[PDB]
Amino acid sequence: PVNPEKLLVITVATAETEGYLRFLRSAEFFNYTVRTLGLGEEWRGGDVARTVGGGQKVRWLKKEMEKYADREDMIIMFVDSYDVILAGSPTELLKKFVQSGSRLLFSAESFCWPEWGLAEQYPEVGTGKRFLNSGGFIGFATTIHQIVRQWKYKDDDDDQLFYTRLYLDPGLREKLSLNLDHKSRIFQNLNGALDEVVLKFDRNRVRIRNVAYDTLPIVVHGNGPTKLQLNYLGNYVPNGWTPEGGCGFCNQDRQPPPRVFLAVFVEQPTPFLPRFLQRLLLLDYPPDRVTLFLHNNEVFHEPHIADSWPQLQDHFSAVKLVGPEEALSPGEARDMAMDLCRQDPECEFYFSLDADAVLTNLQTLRILIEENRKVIAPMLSRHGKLWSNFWGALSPDEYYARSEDYVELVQRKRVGVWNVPYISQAYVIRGDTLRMELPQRDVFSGSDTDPDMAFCKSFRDKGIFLHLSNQHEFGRLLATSRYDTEHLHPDLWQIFDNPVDWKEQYIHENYSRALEGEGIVEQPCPDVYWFPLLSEQMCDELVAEMEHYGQWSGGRHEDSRLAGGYENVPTVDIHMKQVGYEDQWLQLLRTYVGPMTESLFPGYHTKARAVMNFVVRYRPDEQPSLRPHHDSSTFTLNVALNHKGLDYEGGGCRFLRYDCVISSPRKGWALLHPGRLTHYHEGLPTTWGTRYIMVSFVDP
Amino acid sequence: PVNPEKLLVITVATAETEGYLRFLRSAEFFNYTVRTLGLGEEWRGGDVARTVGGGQKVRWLKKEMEKYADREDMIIMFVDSYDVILAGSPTELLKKFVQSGSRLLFSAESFCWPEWGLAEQYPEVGTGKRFLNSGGFIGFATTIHQIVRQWKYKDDDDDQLFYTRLYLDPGLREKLSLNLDHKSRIFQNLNGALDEVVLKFDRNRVRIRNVAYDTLPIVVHGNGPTKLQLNYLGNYVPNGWTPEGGCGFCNQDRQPPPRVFLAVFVEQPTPFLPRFLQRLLLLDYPPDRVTLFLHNNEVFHEPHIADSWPQLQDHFSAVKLVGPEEALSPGEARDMAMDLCRQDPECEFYFSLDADAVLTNLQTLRILIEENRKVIAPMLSRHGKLWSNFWGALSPDEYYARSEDYVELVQRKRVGVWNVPYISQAYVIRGDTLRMELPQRDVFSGSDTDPDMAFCKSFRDKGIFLHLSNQHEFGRLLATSRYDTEHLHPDLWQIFDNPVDWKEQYIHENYSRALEGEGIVEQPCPDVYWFPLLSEQMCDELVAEMEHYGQWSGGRHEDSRLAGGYENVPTVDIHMKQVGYEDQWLQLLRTYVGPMTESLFPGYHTKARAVMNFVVRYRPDEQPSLRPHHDSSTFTLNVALNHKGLDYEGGGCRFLRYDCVISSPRKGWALLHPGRLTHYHEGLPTTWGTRYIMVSFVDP
Ligand SMILES: *[C@@H]1O[C@H](CO)[C@@H](O[C@@H]2O[C@H](CO)[C@@H](O)[C@H](O)[C@H]2NC(C)=O)[C@H](O)[C@H]1NC(C)=O
Ligand SMILES: *[C@@H]1O[C@H](CO)[C@@H](O[C@@H]2O[C@H](CO)[C@@H](O)[C@H](O)[C@H]2NC(C)=O)[C@H](O)[C@H]1NC(C)=O
Ligand SMILES: O=c1ccn([C@@H]2O[C@H](COP(=O)(O)OP(=O)(O)O)[C@@H](O)[C@H]2O)c(=O)[nH]1
Ligand SMILES: O=c1ccn([C@@H]2O[C@H](COP(=O)(O)OP(=O)(O)O)[C@@H](O)[C@H]2O)c(=O)[nH]1
Ligand SMILES: *[C@@H]1O[C@H](CO)[C@@H](O)[C@H](O)[C@H]1NC(C)=O
Ligand SMILES: *[C@@H]1O[C@H](CO)[C@@H](O)[C@H](O)[C@H]1NC(C)=O
Ligand SMILES: O=C(O)CCC(=O)C(=O)O
Ligand SMILES: O=C(O)CCC(=O)C(=O)O
Ligand SMILES: [Fe+2]
Ligand SMILES: [Fe+2]
Ligand SMILES: [Fe+2]
Ligand SMILES: [Fe+2]
Ligand SMILES: [Mn+2]
Ligand SMILES: [Mn+2]
């Protein structure tokens, strides 16, 4: 049993990047001892992510190995650090190295790189990997020194070609007992073997298994174009996220805060923008520490921005607007806003927030700053669907692809802070990162690629992690796909696409409490029920949309009312069908009115059928009253739409068989009464002003 | 101006018949002085209604004229008496006779009788009547004596041939100044001139006018086959019935009563016979003075007669039944019953009453006896129609014909006691008339003619008047045309044909009072109404007719009830359609339920549509309850059909949204409640016995 105190891990790292720090954490998890070579220096090995190189690694190792040229008691493993994580303990590692009977064991891979012609010189292996990979090897210090001391080449010569040529010396291979880890018992190189690797979970740690050879590798190496796949595994292996401990590096359970540049982007017509702009005043972060930047590309939203701008300017430390007259593309506007923070040393954090992002968590900015990341996004999902503001994987064309764990994250089965290839709509970026690591201005722009994709590729090309937190509930994403803007109030028609936000804006606030009972619903007359349904904004926008139509009812117009032996009781009204709002109003009936009817009349069942839906106008100049009648309905919904006293003087509804009068209707509230046989009723005259009501004859 | 005290009316009458007494009354109305010849004697003039004769009249007149052979101061008018009425005063008569310039003026007529060949010997008259009629003439006593003293012929020689031959003597006609009343200024003979005579009304007397000559005759002579036409005129002229005085000989405004033989006839299956038989015990006449005779020709009514016979035998002085086993024809049974009274001197009055005669006036027998007629019928009419128990006129074939005043009598515009050619269904006949004037037994029988027609012709052939009184409301006639007898209770199906009687037997007695208000209708639960609808006989016969069908509901049977989200709430029941009683029950809904619904729910209008009508049976052995549900109806009718406690133990109806229970239903009463949305309700379990209810889902 080889003593673990005789094991030394040597790696190269010219800067303490997020990958290197990820490698170190995995090493400290198993109590390895690591020696890092080249931390202060500048990288002369060339563009290794692009071509061959890395000879500077060998040179540094050869110098380090001269202290250990005679230490037969020492085992030494060399690994890369930016694209490597450790999955197993030193004890299992040393036991597996002894089992190989080798004195210097290299990793094996599927490709003969860089010189593909040398493939013939390699020994034949039946089913394992055949060729050498210099990203990882382990052996005796004496044997390693005999190999690395033969280095005498340029800092930008290929390290792997150097090791490959020595291995392909049959006499030297036999003499020094050199071997390749063909079946990935120790080293797992991901390139060319992505379908062979799966996660293997445990209670408080995670590993990978090679399903082609049924092994449990110690070293995972995201070599070549497998950096993102390793970023995926790195979220779990070894203690990233575990079934019993949750995530391992997130905050989990939670004097002046840092100054922040808040950048808002309105690049398409977006619903409920006034509601968003009012939410900016509610974010729980000292506004004297926040600088607001708002790019509006839509002339449809200029009235919205203008209404809010006095409140915003009075709220934040400083504000700035770049409207549609500047003709900035989305990529030019995002480059400008981020570059405003980059060129301001007082900008410690840059917060980008898009128009379709609803932040239900008012502590989002704080939560994300405490995570102490370079780039981090909060998880936002389109309500009740899988689409969200991030990607878990990329296609070979670097377009969208679903990851093996995407659904578990969106559904918050596994919660934590995740390293993902793509984020959008809302993120917080360290200002220091913009100055020192992403100093160019062409972040979102420069190419034909989409601005939000160029932004993510810009950070990945620098090895910056894009973090995503579902540790908390942060909010949702609005559907903006087919926003119909040709209305006086286009957000009225948003009951199908954004029903959660439509309810918060238009349904009465105390509706839901009334639906659960507890003494809100009233019964002012026998079998007539009274409950809050619509909000004052819903009433005002519905009335206004009616007047904007203008074509009210006149003579020869017929309603489905019953008086005497004839259906000749009309009203001055507009039907939902005429204004194109019938389907929308029927949806309100199914969702909110129907369930209220089944609660108040136990035993009755409704699907909220209604062919007669219309708004009535009562005025002394034209028709101020409505004579007694029955409704062609099983039950009738009667909703006031304005204020008694402020907007009109006069009475409401009278039920004759009871001599009961609804003398003072309430604006948002609705009346529920049967339409046939028993509740013969009358519309008292409007003496001053104008009286608007909404009425549906449901279940005819 | 000739003195009326010099006028003498001479007529012949061997018996004080009703025609002679009718003539005398018209004469006493104008204060004539009448001398009647031959009152004690027997008629030897032959069958004058059949052939020629009347010479006995001339012989009696010739003897009477010998006292006045020299009285030039005396005017004498001779008229028949059985078929003559006087329409004018003696003053107008004498003035018109003087205007003629004649010394003996005969009546004129259209036919040359008896010898038609003598028509050539008559003088030519342009437009008036050409030939002589011996039924009436007026002239000086001296001139009349010179004519009548030439009589020397047989008592059965023709009187008119005698006068005709003397008139056709041109020398004698010129000598004595003989003339014929060509244009009916004085004498109106009806035969051959029926279209020339109309009634002319006045305030307190009536006349006739000749519209061919525009005259107002004094003497109306129903000569030949015009006796019935004169009977018609005799109802008015001269003071029979007047617009201001009403009738002139009727009773108008009303110690042992005479003994009566009451004869009941059941010659066809007749509805509501048990109700008739119970009414016999209610007639307001001392039953110890009435002898009952009942002929039943129908085996269908033997159970009905048997149920009533103990009460009848205990009620009347003596009873007798002649059932279907005797095989008596209707004519043989009516001959027998009348002949039982004829051969009993203690029978003072004979009362014939048929099965289809409903006597609503319990004093009918008294009223008709006080009229002191030989034969008199009360007027009975089929409800709401013109058909009644009498004819006002005859066809030339002596079949039915409508009289000029028939409708005014049936509608009781003119009320009185009328001399009509035909009566039926109910009449009272003096027993003395049967013994002395109609002694034969073949009254209804003897020929192929209908028994009721033979009966009337038998009395007309003897000059007996058939009187009809509409002075009071007496009753009605049942429709018996298409009585469907193939039912356990055929009177249930009588709602269309006899609706007045159907209501009195089957509709609850206090229904109508409840329909007018005054605190009968109850509201035991909110918007549930409770009122009496059916009578106990209706409930018992409806239940019995259901069990007699027997095929109650079982599994797989579906009703139009709503529970949860399914219409799977069944009952053990029978639908009206299965038993052929749907049309009948729908008529009850239209007539009695509908009007009650519009009264209780003001503003609602109904035509009582109902596709679901059925009787439910609740039993502990099979289905004793009904789970909560709604009705596929605008409102529901729920009528109990038996007694709580006597017939079943258990609850009734529970309305859940109100926690209101109809725990003790009343048998005949009905519940009225809405079927949808508000009155979710439950049928409490029947713990003992059997619970029957009738239910309709009206206005679905
Ligand atoms: C919803 O219900 C709340 C509480 O039931 C209402 O709040 C009250 O509003 C009135 C005036 O609008 C105040 O006088 C009370 O003091 C409020 N009560 C509380 C506890 O704050 C609220 O108004 C209702 N919403 C609407 C739209 O009427
Ligand atoms: C119709 O109404 C009358 C009176 O409202 C009812 O007559 C009463 O009947 C009860 C018992 O049935 C007696 O105790 C009362 O003395 C009666 N009152 C009078 C004034 O006679 C009659 O019962 C009702 N008809 C039915 C079928 O119930
Ligand atoms: O600027 C650099 C680039 C390279 N490296 C080290 O050189 C190794 C080789 O780089 P890389 O893993 O990207 O090459 P690959 O394994 O994909 O061939 C990295 O792991 C780092 O440890 C470094 O320290 N600084
Ligand atoms: O039994 C009789 C039949 C006849 N008459 C008288 O004779 C008249 C002639 O009879 P009738 O009127 O019937 O004959 P007609 O006028 O029709 O030819 C009657 O009016 C009676 O006054 C009579 O007194 N007793
Ligand atoms: C690592 O070493 C520490 C002592 O330095 C020890 O407490 C801990 O249990 C070790 N962990 C593992 C996984 O060996
Ligand atoms: C008939 O005579 C009486 C007197 O005897 C007289 O009172 C009456 O008015 C007379 N009637 C007529 C109609 O002449
Ligand atoms: O004016 C009212 O409140 C009654 C209106 C009404 O009943 C109807 O429009 O059907
Ligand atoms: O048993 C009852 O009274 C209720 C019967 C009922 O509701 C029905 O038959 O529809
Ligand atoms: Fe309308
Ligand atoms: Fe209405
Ligand atoms: Fe049924
Ligand atoms: Fe029911
Ligand atoms: Mn590497
Ligand atoms: Mn005559």
Short mmCIF file of N, CA, C and O in Angstrom, two decimals, chain A residues 527 529 564 600-605 630 634-635 657-658 674 677-678 680, chain B residues 527 529 564 600-605 630 634-635 657-658 674 677-678 680:
data_model
loop_
_atom_site.label_atom_id
_atom_site.label_comp_id
_atom_site.label_asym_id
_atom_site.label_seq_id
_atom_site.Cartn_x
_atom_site.Cartn_y
_atom_site.Cartn_z
N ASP A 527 -81.02 35.28 -2.95
CA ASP A 527 -80.47 34.59 -4.12
C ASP A 527 -79.83 35.55 -5.12
O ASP A 527 -79.69 35.23 -6.30
N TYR A 529 -76.18 37.54 -5.32
CA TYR A 529 -74.87 37.56 -4.67
C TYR A 529 -74.01 38.69 -5.23
O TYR A 529 -74.14 39.09 -6.38
N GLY A 564 -93.47 40.67 -20.42
CA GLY A 564 -94.79 40.29 -20.88
C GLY A 564 -94.76 39.03 -21.71
O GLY A 564 -94.36 37.96 -21.22
N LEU A 600 -71.11 29.63 -4.81
CA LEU A 600 -72.23 30.32 -4.17
C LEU A 600 -73.54 29.57 -4.31
O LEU A 600 -74.43 29.72 -3.46
N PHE A 601 -73.70 28.77 -5.37
CA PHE A 601 -74.89 27.94 -5.58
C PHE A 601 -74.45 26.48 -5.55
O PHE A 601 -74.25 25.87 -6.61
N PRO A 602 -74.29 25.90 -4.37
CA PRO A 602 -73.78 24.53 -4.27
C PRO A 602 -74.70 23.54 -4.97
O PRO A 602 -75.92 23.54 -4.76
N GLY A 603 -74.11 22.69 -5.81
CA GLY A 603 -74.83 21.73 -6.62
C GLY A 603 -74.88 22.08 -8.09
O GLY A 603 -75.01 21.19 -8.93
N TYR A 604 -74.77 23.37 -8.42
CA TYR A 604 -74.80 23.81 -9.80
C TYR A 604 -73.42 23.68 -10.43
O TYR A 604 -72.39 23.87 -9.77
N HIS A 605 -73.40 23.35 -11.72
CA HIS A 605 -72.16 23.18 -12.47
C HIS A 605 -72.22 24.02 -13.74
O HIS A 605 -73.25 24.06 -14.42
N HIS A 630 -87.27 39.69 -17.59
CA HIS A 630 -86.45 38.54 -17.27
C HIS A 630 -85.28 38.46 -18.24
O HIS A 630 -85.28 39.07 -19.31
N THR A 634 -79.66 31.33 -17.43
CA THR A 634 -79.81 30.63 -16.16
C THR A 634 -79.42 31.53 -15.00
O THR A 634 -80.14 31.63 -14.00
N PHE A 635 -78.28 32.21 -15.11
CA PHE A 635 -77.91 33.26 -14.17
C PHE A 635 -77.23 34.39 -14.94
O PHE A 635 -76.71 34.20 -16.04
N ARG A 657 -90.16 41.15 -7.20
CA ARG A 657 -90.81 40.16 -6.35
C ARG A 657 -90.30 40.20 -4.91
O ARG A 657 -90.88 39.53 -4.05
N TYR A 658 -89.26 40.97 -4.63
CA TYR A 658 -88.69 41.08 -3.30
C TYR A 658 -88.73 42.49 -2.73
O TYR A 658 -88.48 42.66 -1.53
N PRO A 674 -80.32 34.78 -10.59
CA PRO A 674 -80.97 33.98 -11.63
C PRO A 674 -81.69 34.86 -12.64
O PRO A 674 -82.17 35.95 -12.32
N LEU A 677 -87.86 33.38 -14.22
CA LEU A 677 -88.97 32.99 -13.35
C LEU A 677 -89.09 33.78 -12.06
O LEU A 677 -90.16 34.32 -11.74
N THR A 678 -88.01 33.87 -11.30
CA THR A 678 -88.07 34.36 -9.93
C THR A 678 -87.54 35.77 -9.75
O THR A 678 -88.07 36.51 -8.91
N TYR A 680 -87.59 38.73 -11.63
CA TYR A 680 -88.08 39.85 -12.43
C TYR A 680 -87.53 41.16 -11.89
O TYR A 680 -87.77 41.51 -10.73
N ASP B 527 -89.26 30.80 -2.25
CA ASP B 527 -89.53 30.58 -3.67
C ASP B 527 -90.04 29.17 -3.96
O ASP B 527 -89.93 28.69 -5.09
N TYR B 529 -93.71 27.25 -3.56
CA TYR B 529 -95.11 27.55 -3.29
C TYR B 529 -95.93 26.27 -3.19
O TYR B 529 -95.61 25.25 -3.80
N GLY B 564 -74.16 16.60 -9.98
CA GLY B 564 -72.75 16.70 -10.32
C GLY B 564 -72.55 17.18 -11.74
O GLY B 564 -72.97 18.28 -12.10
N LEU B 600 -98.26 33.45 -8.99
CA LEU B 600 -97.33 33.37 -7.87
C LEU B 600 -95.96 33.95 -8.20
O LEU B 600 -95.26 34.42 -7.29
N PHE B 601 -95.56 33.94 -9.47
CA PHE B 601 -94.31 34.54 -9.92
C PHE B 601 -94.64 35.67 -10.88
O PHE B 601 -94.60 35.49 -12.11
N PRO B 602 -94.99 36.85 -10.36
CA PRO B 602 -95.41 37.95 -11.23
C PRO B 602 -94.31 38.35 -12.21
O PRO B 602 -93.16 38.56 -11.82
N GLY B 603 -94.68 38.46 -13.48
CA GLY B 603 -93.76 38.77 -14.56
C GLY B 603 -93.47 37.58 -15.46
O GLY B 603 -93.13 37.77 -16.63
N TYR B 604 -93.60 36.37 -14.94
CA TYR B 604 -93.35 35.17 -15.72
C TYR B 604 -94.58 34.79 -16.53
O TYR B 604 -95.72 34.98 -16.10
N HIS B 605 -94.33 34.26 -17.73
CA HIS B 605 -95.39 33.84 -18.63
C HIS B 605 -95.16 32.41 -19.08
O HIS B 605 -94.03 32.02 -19.38
N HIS B 630 -80.70 18.71 -9.57
CA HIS B 630 -81.49 19.76 -10.18
C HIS B 630 -82.46 19.15 -11.19
O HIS B 630 -82.29 18.01 -11.63
N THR B 634 -87.65 24.88 -16.01
CA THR B 634 -87.69 26.22 -15.44
C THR B 634 -88.35 26.20 -14.07
O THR B 634 -87.83 26.79 -13.11
N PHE B 635 -89.49 25.53 -13.95
CA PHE B 635 -90.09 25.26 -12.65
C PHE B 635 -90.69 23.86 -12.67
O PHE B 635 -90.99 23.30 -13.73
N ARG B 657 -79.88 24.17 -0.19
CA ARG B 657 -79.34 25.51 -0.03
C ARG B 657 -80.11 26.33 1.01
O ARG B 657 -79.65 27.43 1.36
N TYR B 658 -81.23 25.83 1.50
CA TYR B 658 -82.04 26.53 2.49
C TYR B 658 -82.20 25.78 3.79
O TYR B 658 -82.68 26.37 4.77
N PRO B 674 -88.49 26.43 -8.53
CA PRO B 674 -87.62 26.46 -9.70
C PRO B 674 -86.78 25.19 -9.79
O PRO B 674 -86.44 24.57 -8.78
N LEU B 677 -80.33 25.78 -10.77
CA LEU B 677 -79.38 26.70 -10.14
C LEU B 677 -79.56 26.88 -8.64
O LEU B 677 -78.61 26.72 -7.87
N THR B 678 -80.77 27.21 -8.21
CA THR B 678 -80.99 27.67 -6.85
C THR B 678 -81.63 26.64 -5.94
O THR B 678 -81.32 26.62 -4.75
N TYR B 680 -81.43 23.16 -5.54
CA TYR B 680 -80.87 21.82 -5.38
C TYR B 680 -81.59 21.09 -4.25
O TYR B 680 -81.60 21.55 -3.11
#
